A paper describes a structure:
DsbA from E. coli K−12 (EcDsbA) was the first and is probably the best-characterised DSB enzyme to date. This 21 kDa periplasmic protein is a dithiol oxidase that catalyses disulphide bond formation between consecutive cysteines of unfolded polypeptides as they are translocated to the periplasm. EcDsbA consists of a canonical TRX domain, a hallmark of proteins involved in redox homeostasis, with an inserted helical domain. The TRX domain harbours the conserved active site CXXC (C30-P31-H32-C33 in EcDsbA) that is featured in many proteins of the TRX superfamily. The acidity of this groove originates from a cluster of negatively charged residues (E24, E37, E38, D44, E85, D86 and E94) that map along a buried channel in the interface between the TRX and helical domains of EcDsbA.
DsbA K58A and double-mutant E24A/K58A were crystalised in space group C2, with two molecules per asymmetric unit. In comparison, overlay of chain A of wildtype DsbA and chain A of the E24A/K58A mutant showed the smallest difference, with an RMSD of 0.34 Å over 174 Cα atoms. The crystal structures of the three mutants containing the K58A mutation showed that the shorter alanine side chain at position 58 significantly expanded the size of the entrance to the buried channel. In all three crystal structures, a glycerol molecule, used for cryoprotection, was modelled into the electron density. The binding of glycerol displaced w2 in all three structures and hindered precise analysis of the water network in these mutants. When E37 was present in the protein structures, water w3 was observed to form a hydrogen bond with E37 in both K58A and E24A/K58A structures. However, the double-mutant E24A/K58A yielded a rate constant of 1.47 ± 0.06 × 106 M−1 s −1, 35% slower than that of wildtype EcDsbA. Mutation of two or more of the E24, E37 and K58 further increased the “disordered” solvent content, reducing the structured hydrogen bond network between the charged residues and the w1–w4 water molecules. Indeed, both E24A/K58A and E24A/E37A/K58A mutants displayed significantly lower thiol oxidase activity compared to the wildtype protein (although the more reducing redox potential of the latter would also affect its oxidase activity). While native DsbA rapidly oxidised the substrate peptide (in less than 10 s), in the case of the DsbA double E24A/K58A and triple E24A/E37A/K58A mutants, oxidised DsbA was present in the reaction for over 10 and 20 s, respectively.
Residue numbers in the entry: 1 to 188
The structure:
């Protein structure tokens, strides 16, 4: 078949009940995640092909970067709570990997301030139990899919994308294959 278990995707041996329909995991420290988001625009291209009523969810992971990695998971929870993911994704990726100006929790906060989030609003969110819950939710989801590495993407809590089984001849064809595989899986 054109789509094959073991080729473009794999099947979780322990499917996750109640998982977001399309769930991506990433780290702002992950070089492949930087390529996926800033050069290939994987997330945007997946979203443009999702069936009606299917949304993408993206969660950060703790296992890269020690202390700062966990600060970034908490800041990503702030971005999700405030609805500012689209304002901070590029400067967080660039701050960590391009300019390497993000070295502390305060430096993360500066990205939000420069993006127009008010200081009091950031600090209230950072310290909130809503954000504590969103950190726990990102951690629980990674545990539930037995996450090993990033980037990763999971569909319906049952299928894991396998980019290494896709055609990497051309970067844009690869992005197309990835997005079309997510759509195929969301309809399975």
């Amino acid at each position: 078949a054109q789509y094959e278990d073991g080729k473009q995707y794999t099947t979780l041996e322990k499917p996750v009940a109640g998982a977001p329909q399309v769930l991506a995991f990433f780290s702002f420290f992950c070089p492949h995640c930087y390529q996926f988001e800033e050069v290939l625009h994987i997330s945007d291209n997946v979203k443009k092909k999702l069936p009606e009523g299917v949304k993408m969810t993206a969660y950060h992971v703790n296992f890269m970067g020690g202390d700062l990695g966990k600060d970034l998971t908490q800041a990503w929870a702030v971005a999700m709570a405030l609805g500012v993911e689209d304002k901070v994704t590029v400067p967080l990726f660039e701050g960590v990997q391009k300019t390497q100006t993000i070295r502390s929790a305060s430096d993360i906060r500066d990205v939000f301030i420069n993006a127009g989030i008010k200081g009091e609003e950031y600090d209230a969110a950072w310290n909130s139990f809503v954000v504590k819950s969103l950190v726990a939710q990102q951690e629980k989801a990674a545990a539930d899919v037995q996450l090993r590495g990033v980037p990763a993407m999971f569909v319906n809590g049952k299928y894991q994308l396998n980019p290494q089984g896709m055609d990497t001849s051309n970067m844009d064809v690869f992005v197309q294959q990835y997005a079309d595989t997510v759509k195929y899986l969301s309809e399975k």
